[PDB]
């Protein structure tokens, strides 16, 4: 009865009033490509390293099942599809979101959404958490806070699914296109710090052809970062 | 994204742009109680005895998985939950739905909805087809046709799920209550013909404590009908 007109993403949608995690459910269940798993609230929502992702009622918490018949080298760009999709949807609602490489979307430097891509066999799970009308952690923001009024959650869902379907269908044919859309919507030319054993600071210049973040250290040395479990912050 | 606040029915919802039959999917798949299977259209929708059920886009085609812990003798009353639920939803939209015993809902004697219950052990599937904005076959009508304008399909879905959840919750506690609601919303006091192995005509007087249709033949003979595979016709 939703009447979705998308081609792949959204051919089927499984909704839960409550779930542990849409990403976990998508990883452990046999689901056809394009299936969207969405829930009003998650009790065990997570980001990387099992980090807790606050998922109270009011936000958009979903995962999408994908099985990209593209070269192995291209699979790492799926996270960008989610990020750009969110930016496009925010724009439709007159909100200017900017991508914090490589999985976050910020509005005036406050985090409004996060993306988490996981694998299980040859299935890829694209998870997206977007703050809409829900309470958010201090420092973060939501569509409601930016617009000053409650936003119709289903309208946001319809918009995002439509944008992701378009981005994904093009990705299957032209996998390099997503990189320029990311570059034009990403926070660059600013100083950042990458943590971990041997942490360092430098200017985030761009992303390369593999989606790696290019950082120029004060010494002039250029490092290429693969997100993985690294921590990035704007100083 | 839906924000359903029901207790059992609607805890989970699986939506399909297209499906063979929501009843078949529900019967076949491993699903939790309360799960609603809904599709924009069905390619192989059916009623009893594999009779074709036209399910074009615009209508509400859904099935609900139930595992009612009530006496075996009460299970035949589940069809009434579907019929009454539909009537209540129609009344909420100011449409005069009346029950044609025991599985159909009519508006001005034209079929607007049909209920089909299929069971097997600890699993009952309550199927409901309601014409909303879709084109319908002759002898039928739709909400749009009766109101003279299109009706928001999602609004009808929310209304029906809420009514069904309430009716089901009460059914688990008092399986007899549904019979009073059927009596107050069913077409009675008119001549009908029962078509099965042979046939007979008489006045549809009421339904008894088992939900059987009580018919008074002209001779004065009283027959108690169990729907099963018989058909009821108005004269
Ligand atoms: N609803 C939310 N809105 C915004 N940020 C959230 C929300 N829930 C949790 N967070 C924050 O987001 C992080 C989520 O996990 P994850 O590591 O995947 O995000 P990240 O941005 O890539 O990493 P980082 O912790 O360095 O910001 C948590 O550590 C938490 O600080
Ligand atoms: N969209 C629709 N709206 C109304 N009626 C329909 C629709 N699609 C099919 N039908 C009719 O409904 C019937 C459905 O099957 P079923 O036997 O279960 O219903 P019934 O009302 O109990 O039987 P009967 O048609 O003999 O009175 C079909 O035989 C067909 O005539
Ligand atoms: O902060 C990030 O960048 C990652 C957060 C990803 C959150 C979404 S909410 C839908 C899905 N289910 C989860 O448990 N995580 C992801
Ligand atoms: O006419 C009747 O009384 C029965 C029709 C039941 C139709 C619904 S549509 C949703 C579900 N899926 C099916 O194939 N049949 C039922």
Domain that holds residue A218: 188-235
**Does residue A200 share a domain with residue A114?**
no
**Does residue B23 share a domain with residue B10?**
yes
Name which of A212, A193, A211, A195 is nearest A203 in CA terms.
Answer: A193
- Pairwise CA distance, residues A181 & A176, whole Å: 10
**Structural domains of chain B, count:** 2
Closest-approach residue (CA) in chain A for B11 = A17
**Does residue B207 share a domain with residue B122?**
no
Token pair of B4, please?
Answer: 């359903």
- Pairwise CA distance, residues A11 & B203, whole Å: 48
Residue B36 CB-density burial (10 A; 0-12 exposed, 13-18 middle, 19+ buried): buried
- Pairwise CA distance, residues A60 & A72, whole Å: 30
**3-class secondary structure per residue, A49-71:** HHCECCCCCCCEEEEEEECCCCC
**Does residue A163 share a domain with residue A108?**
yes
**Does residue A183 share a domain with residue A198?**
no
Token pair of A41, please?
Answer: 């609230």
Token pair of B215, please?
Answer: 């018919």
**Does residue B229 share a domain with residue B167?**
no
**What residues in B contact A162, CB-CB < 8 Å?**
none
Interface contact flag, A17 B10, Cβ < 8 Å = yes
CA distance B204 to chain A (A): 36
- Pairwise CA distance, residues A37 & A31, whole Å: 10
**Does residue B219 share a domain with residue B163?**
no
**Does residue A161 share a domain with residue A201?**
no
Q: What contacts B26, CB < 8 A, 6 or more positions away? A: B35, B37, B63, B64, B65, B125, B127
Cis peptide before A136 (omega within 30 of 0): no
Q: Is B192 within 8 Å of B202 (Cβ atoms)?
A: yes
Q: Is B207 within 8 Å of B179 (Cβ atoms)?
A: yes
Diameter over CA atoms, chain A: 59
- Pairwise CA distance, residues B130 & B90, whole Å: 10
B1 near A CB under 8 A:
yes
CA-derived radius of gyration, chain B: 17
**Does residue A200 share a domain with residue A181?**
no
- Assign residue B200 the CATH number of its domain: 2.30.30.100
From atom 14 of ligand 2, which residue's Cα is the shortest distance away? B47
Give the method used. Answer: X-ray
Strand ranges across the sheet with B222-225: B222-225, B213-216, B198-207, B191-196, B231-234
User: Quick one: residue B111, left, alpha or beta (phi over 0 = left, psi -120 to 50 = alpha)?
Assistant: beta
Residues B21, B22, B26, B29: is their CA dihedral positive or negative?
Answer: positive
**Does residue A98 share a domain with residue A63?**
yes
**Pairing assessment for the beta strands A36-42 and A12-19 based on DSSP bridges:** parallel
**Does residue A82 share a domain with residue A29?**
yes
- Assign residue A70 the CATH number of its domain: 3.30.930.10
Of B2, B10, B16, the CB nearest to A12: B16
């Amino acid at each position: 009865m939703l009447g979705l007109k998308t081609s792949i993403i959204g051919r089927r949608v499984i909704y839960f009033q409550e779930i542990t995690s849409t990403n976990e459910f998508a990883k452990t269940s046999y689901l056809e490509e394009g299936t969207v798993i969405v829930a009003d609230k998650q009790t065990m929502g997570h980001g990387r390293l099992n980090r807790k992702w606050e998922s109270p009622e009011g936000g958009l918490w979903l995962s999408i099942v994908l099985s990209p018949k593209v070269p192995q080298k291209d699979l790492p760009k799926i996270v960008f599809l989610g990020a750009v999709g969110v930016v496009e949807t925010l724009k439709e609602f007159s909100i200017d979101g900017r991508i914090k490489w490589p999985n976050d979307v910020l509005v005036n430097y406050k985090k409004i959404a996060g993306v988490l891509v996981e694998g299980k066999g040859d299935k890829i799970v694209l998870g997206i958490g977007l703050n809409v009308n829900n309470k958010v952690p201090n420092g973060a923001t939501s569509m409601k806070l930016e617009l000053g009024s409650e936003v119709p959650l289903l309208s946001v869902f319809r918009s995002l699914i439509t944008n992701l379907d378009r981005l994904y269908l093009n990705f299957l044919k032209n996998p390099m296109d997503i990189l320029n859309l990311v570059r034009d919507n990403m926070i660059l030319g600013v100083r950042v710090k990458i943590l971990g054993d041997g942490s360092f600071e430098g200017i985030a210049e761009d992303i390369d052809d593999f989606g790696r973040l290019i950082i120029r250290l004060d010494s002039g040395e250029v490092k290429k970062v693969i997100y993985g479990d690294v921590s990035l912050r704007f100083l």
